[PDB]
């Protein structure tokens, strides 16, 4: 249902979106997550947009990811300006019920998955 793309091998600094493409029916009555998994690391939580398009950030991730949906389209993306080496990893898209509040962050709120898309950041 979930389709990533946009992943390959990008400059430092520079800036890059990533799509998320939902199959079948109508997307926009889901809250929109992103997740990343960096090389080593367990899952970490990047933003999320609910169905009102209210952002939440993550507590840690310091204001630095963009979330827009575009209902018109079954897609929500995700833009990282000023790409650091440490941005390196499995980017998922994922689909709630929930809605916007701090339940937003744990990835056990969501309930399907992409299949995930490879952001190398290199010089």
């Known amino acids: 249902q979930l389709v990533e793309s946009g992943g390959g091998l990008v400059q430092p600094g520079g800036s890059l979106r990533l799509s998320c493409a939902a199959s079948g029916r109508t997307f926009s009555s889901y809250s929109m997550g992103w997740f990343r998994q960096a090389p080593g690391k367990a899952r970490e939580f990047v933003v999320a947009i609910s169905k009102g398009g209210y952002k939440y950030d993550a507590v840690s991730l310091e204001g630095r990811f963009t979330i827009s949906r575009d209902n018109a389209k079954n897609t929500v993306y995700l833009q990282i300006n000023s790409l650091r080496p440490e941005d390196t990893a499995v980017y998922y898209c994922?689909?709630?019920?929930?809605?916007?509040?701090?339940?937003?962050?744990?990835?056990?709120?969501?309930?399907?998955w992409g299949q995930g898309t490879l952001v190398t950041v290199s010089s």
């Open positions: 994922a689909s709630s019920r929930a809605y916007g509040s701090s339940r937003l962050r744990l990835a056990d709120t969501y309930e399907y």
